[PDB]
Amino acid sequence: PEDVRFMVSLSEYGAILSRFFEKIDFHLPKPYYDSSIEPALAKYIEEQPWSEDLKTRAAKYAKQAVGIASWYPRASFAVRFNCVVITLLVIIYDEDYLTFGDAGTEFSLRLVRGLPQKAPFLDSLAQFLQNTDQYLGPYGSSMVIKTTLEFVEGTNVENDFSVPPDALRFPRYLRVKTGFAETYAHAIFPNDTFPEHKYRKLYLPALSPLCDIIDFTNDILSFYKETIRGTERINYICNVANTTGSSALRCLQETVDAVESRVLEIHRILAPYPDLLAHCNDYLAAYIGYHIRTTSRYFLDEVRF
Amino acid sequence: DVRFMVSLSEYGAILSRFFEKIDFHLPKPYYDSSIEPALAKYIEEQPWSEDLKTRAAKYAKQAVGIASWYPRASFAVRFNCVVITLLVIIYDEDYLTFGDAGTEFSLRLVRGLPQKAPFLDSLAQFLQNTDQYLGPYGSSMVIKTTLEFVEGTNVENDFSEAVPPDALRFPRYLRVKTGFAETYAHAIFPNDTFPEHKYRKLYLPALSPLCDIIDFTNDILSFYKETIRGTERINYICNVANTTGSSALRCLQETVDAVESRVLEIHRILAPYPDLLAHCNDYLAAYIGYHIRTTSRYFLDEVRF
Amino acid sequence: VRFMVSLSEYGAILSRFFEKIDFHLPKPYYDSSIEPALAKYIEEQPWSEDLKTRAAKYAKQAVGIASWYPRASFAVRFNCVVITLLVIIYDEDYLTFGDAGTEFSLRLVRGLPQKAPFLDSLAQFLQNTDQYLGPYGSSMVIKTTLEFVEGTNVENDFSEAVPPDALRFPRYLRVKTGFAETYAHAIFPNDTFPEHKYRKLYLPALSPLCDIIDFTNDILSFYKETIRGTERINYICNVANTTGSSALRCLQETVDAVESRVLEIHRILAPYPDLLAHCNDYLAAYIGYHIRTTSRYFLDEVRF
Amino acid sequence: DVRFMVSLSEYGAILSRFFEKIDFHLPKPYYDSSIEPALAKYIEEQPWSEDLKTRAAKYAKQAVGIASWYPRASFAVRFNCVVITLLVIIYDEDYLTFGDAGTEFSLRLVRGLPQKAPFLDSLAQFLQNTDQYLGPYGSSMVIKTTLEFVEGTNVENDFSEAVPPDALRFPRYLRVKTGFAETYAHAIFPNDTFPEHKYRKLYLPALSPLCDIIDFTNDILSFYKETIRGTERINYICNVANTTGSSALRCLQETVDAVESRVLEIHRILAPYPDLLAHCNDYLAAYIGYHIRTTSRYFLDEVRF
Ligand SMILES: [Mg+2]
Ligand SMILES: [Mg+2]
Numbered sequence A: 001p002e003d004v005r006f007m008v009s010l011s012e013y014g015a016i017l018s019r020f021f022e023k024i025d026f027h028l029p030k031p032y033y034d035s036s037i038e039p040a041l042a043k044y045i046e047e048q049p050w051s052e053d054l055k056t057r058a059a060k061y062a063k064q065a066v067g068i069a070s071w072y073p074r075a076s077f078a079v080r081f082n083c084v085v086i087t088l089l090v091i092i093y094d095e096d097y098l099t100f101g102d103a104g105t106e107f108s109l110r111l112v113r114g115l116p117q118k119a120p121f122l123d124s125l126a127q128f129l130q131n132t133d134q135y136l137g138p139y140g141s142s143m144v145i146k147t148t149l150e151f152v153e154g155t156n157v158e159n160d161f162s163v164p165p166d167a168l169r170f171p172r173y174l175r176v177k178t179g180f181a182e183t184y185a186h187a188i189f190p191n192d193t194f195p196e197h198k199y200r201k202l203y204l205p206a207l208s209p210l211c212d213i214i215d216f217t218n219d220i221l222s223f224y225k226e227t228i229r230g231t232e233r234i235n236y237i238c239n240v241a242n243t244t245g246s247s248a249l250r251c252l253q254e255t256v257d258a259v260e261s262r263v264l265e266i267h268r269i270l271a272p273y274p275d276l277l278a279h280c281n282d283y284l285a286a287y288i289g290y291h292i293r294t295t296s297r298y299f300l301d302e303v304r305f
Numbered sequence B, D: 001d002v003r004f005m006v007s008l009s010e011y012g013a014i015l016s017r018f019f020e021k022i023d024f025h026l027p028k029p030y031y032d033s034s035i036e037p038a039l040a041k042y043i044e045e046q047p048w049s050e051d052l053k054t055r056a057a058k059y060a061k062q063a064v065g066i067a068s069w070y071p072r073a074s075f076a077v078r079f080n081c082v083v084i085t086l087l088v089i090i091y092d093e094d095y096l097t098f099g100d101a102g103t104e105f106s107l108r109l110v111r112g113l114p115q116k117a118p119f120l121d122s123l124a125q126f127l128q129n130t131d132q133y134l135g136p137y138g139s140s141m142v143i144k145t146t147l148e149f150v151e152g153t154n155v156e157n158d159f160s161e162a163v164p165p166d167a168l169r170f171p172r173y174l175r176v177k178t179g180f181a182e183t184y185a186h187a188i189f190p191n192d193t194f195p196e197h198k199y200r201k202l203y204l205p206a207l208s209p210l211c212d213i214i215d216f217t218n219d220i221l222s223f224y225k226e227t228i229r230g231t232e233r234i235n236y237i238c239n240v241a242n243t244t245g246s247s248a249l250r251c252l253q254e255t256v257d258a259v260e261s262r263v264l265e266i267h268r269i270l271a272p273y274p275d276l277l278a279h280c281n282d283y284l285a286a287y288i289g290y291h292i293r294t295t296s297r298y299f300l301d302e303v304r305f
Numbered sequence C: 001v002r003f004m005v006s007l008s009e010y011g012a013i014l015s016r017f018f019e020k021i022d023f024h025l026p027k028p029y030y031d032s033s034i035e036p037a038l039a040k041y042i043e044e045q046p047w048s049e050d051l052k053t054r055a056a057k058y059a060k061q062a063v064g065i066a067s068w069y070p071r072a073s074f075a076v077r078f079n080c081v082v083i084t085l086l087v088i089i090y091d092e093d094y095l096t097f098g099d100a101g102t103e104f105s106l107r108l109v110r111g112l113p114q115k116a117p118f119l120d121s122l123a124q125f126l127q128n129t130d131q132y133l134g135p136y137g138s139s140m141v142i143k144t145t146l147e148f149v150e151g152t153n154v155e156n157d158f159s160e161a162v163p164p165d166a167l168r169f170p171r172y173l174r175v176k177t178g179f180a181e182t183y184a185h186a187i188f189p190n191d192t193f194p195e196h197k198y199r200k201l202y203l204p205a206l207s208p209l210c211d212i213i214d215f216t217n218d219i220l221s222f223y224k225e226t227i228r229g230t231e232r233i234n235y236i237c238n239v240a241n242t243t244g245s246s247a248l249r250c251l252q253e254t255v256d257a258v259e260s261r262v263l264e265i266h267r268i269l270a271p272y273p274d275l276l277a278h279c280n281d282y283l284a285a286y287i288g289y290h291i292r293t294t295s296r297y298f299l300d301e302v303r304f
């Protein structure tokens, strides 16, 4: 009885997704395969000064990280592989931040102090941030760093709201902090293809709508695995329903409309720049297709859309 | 063009209505005799050039007023807020004079390397010691906000006549990057009075509306010195006017309305927690009062309200 | 004699009562977590092993209180079950603690150890109600517990001693013994209904709700107290002894009073559908609990 | 609004009729030269701010008259009732000045913790020492009544506009919570004269009507300073007029009639016990007299009766 507000019937959820895909003209990409990413990530893991136990667990985490390469089908190996590596490291964080007790709780200070971290995988995370200039310009590097700091600490703080009714702006704030979207958005515009000194002023207006698309599209497409089929009640859609007193269904529909509006805004902003726009369109189709095709995480074969 | 061009009389009347709506009353003057001597000692201790020290003595006259924003806080909180204010005033005022040093800040910071200019070393050392007055989430947020501020300052004028007409989300995105709001908002809730492990879950829902209040209230109160009296056409209100094809006058009113809504939201969220609410109210009264009293920066003694 | 009520008279009163308030027995409520959590609670108290052994019996009665708050969190349901176990132990065995109860309130505010370990557990519960209530609710649970401990200690002083002209005294004593505010404040738990926003909405319903809680137990426990048992200092008998009326008349008047309060609560909380829903769930399960808990109220011996 | 209007002529006539119907005669003036010095010494001994001690000099002059309510009682009874009156006057007139301190009084009291304000430590100490003049039942009732008074005061501002017209029993509920009556009623029957083991079963049947007399008689006698001379519209009389669709004049008269009825009830219940009844008669005459004589609080020398 108390859970009705957060449930959505399967037929209605499938209809939400069908309307969403119609409205943004989503067309599923052909199946992505990159026989290069998995061996390279295995070699990365082997090279880390990690315990045998962490390397063993990282094999499972790597299976899910490698799908991120499919989001940037045209990008250089450097872009795809680095996006995959940072995804592996934040999956490990999401798994171990409580086990490591207070480790990530000191990540940012130890990072800016140049001090060894309390766990080797956090040293690997520090080194990644130290070498983002391998694939991003300096603005992109800065934002990957600041986004990682937000993610580490927001993940810590998330575990405290297992949400005040009057806090209308809080659900989006929490989702910004833990969604990691800015890191992926910057790889839509890699520094080798779009050097910042010439292109940053052209694509910067699209970064905020892209970050919304990345967060919100995952909220729409992972609501089944999080809340319908799962036990998750403190995600963005449930938080919005709690602070507005609305149903999960109505919040999902508002979020669908928000994504469509961001897509339209990006299509308008980047109309003069066909290559920048093509990178955005390619990302979005690959991103949605990744959610549909990865059934071990999102279970979308169980929904009719 | 007519889009801009807000009259002195129109602007004063809008400010009058704003102060009436939020029931603003100018606080009695705030004075702590320990702040300026401490800040003079800080400046004298920095390995800065003599001209930067003289100029910093000028900027200090503006920075010391920040202590009044936190009247119930410890000296360490008030003084550190004053110091970081001095540093970001220097960065903004003189970021032509540092050359490319700012563009290297984030990577040198996370590599544990010295900065290209000693002024930026002072900034890095501040970030390394934010745990002296904030908890772990607040310290991370000051670090990440400073990275955004340095990079947003660097890119701000790239958009001089280059704001795309339909880029609706961009003005807010740029203002988040340049406004530095999270740094001040977190010191509203110092870790000694409100330790994070007990209070963070209580005040965190208030941080996002507080950041909107900080950003937007400066936009309202500094529109005179930026756009009516000055030549700035790349600030938040002008960016909203150019992205919406609307007048600066109407966008200024829209920003007043947004701040008024945020003040109501904070008052609702923090109602159960009188201490947190009092720190917030003290902050808001003194932040507005600082804009009125610092005539050398905002020239509001020239407007009738 | 003036207190004789036959089985048939009593069952007919209950039948008409249930019809008039449109009572329907809820479907059985079960949370597999409640009974083991209460067993672990008992195991961790530093009570005598004899009291722990005894307390298993009272636990079987206490666990049903979770069904009064079916939409509430485990913290609300479980803490209501714990305080129920403690007050049942007090309600049945207060004489086994000697004069310990008489010093409970002063030892509590002084920070002194209680005269019996069981009362230390009661004090610890009162110190932790912020786990599930706001500040107003926490204060009410404390003040209600002080009243309950003292009303229980003095109740039986009035056997064959209730003075005829004291028409307000039966209600005064029932407020003290009924423990109602503790349960009423849990109907509106602080996580679902943060006090600062909702207390102005539900506080106007507290007075009739406490009347419903006290009086509905008086109606439904009259069989075990006075027909099947020997209790003659309960609310119904006290009213009969101050008014010179039969127990049957006073029982009927109490039923009529409850029906009126039910209409009142429905009027007060009608603009607030979630508050109203928690209230209705509470009342249906409160009555149902009296019917199903045959080991305490024996209502399977009555035809209604 | 005409519904709450009572003229000075009407109010004086109501008081004259009330006094003649209960056979009230202003008691011959009461004086114990020990009480005022003892309260000055109590104030001087508290670890309060000099400002609070200065304000408490004003409140003490209203508190010392409480000793006249118990003219046949020991100094322990009279002085303790004066002290707790001082403390609840400080709480009420000035819980603007204490903030959230009162909101955590009850939990800090039962946890054995220091209170957030020294004044509230004095209140907690009083509650711990009521066995100096009451038996165990009376001590419990003073504690529970103080908790009700503190919380009812803390929430009184929720209905500052009006109470819900639909909640007929709520005006009495509110008045019980904030009237503090049980604390004063139990001192009518002090434990040194009427040991609870023998006397409680004799006077407890009178406590409910006595609490009504205390609450309602103040409502009658403070109506002038609250609603005719002042601007209060959320006291018991006005709340009853709001919930019953009647006028404040009719509700004032009905409250007078209720008090007269309770007085007769008390005389009947305690008729067999002349010393118990005498303590009640002394109390009521001095309670009414206190309202007449404490012109700095009730202004009844501005009324003709
Ligand atoms: Mg998700
Ligand atoms: Mg997740």
Ligand SMILES: [Mg+2]
Pocket: B092
């Ligand atoms: Mg500026």
Ligand SMILES: [Mg+2]
Pocket: B218, B219, B222, B223, B226
């Ligand atoms: Mg500005």
Ligand SMILES: [Mg+2]
Pocket: C091
């Ligand atoms: Mg019983």
Ligand SMILES: [Mg+2]
Pocket: C217, C218, C221, C222, C225
């Ligand atoms: Mg009973």
Ligand SMILES: [Mg+2]
Pocket: none
């Ligand atoms: Mg008053």
Ligand SMILES: [Mg+2]
Pocket: D218, D219, D222, D223, D226
């Ligand atoms: Mg009064």
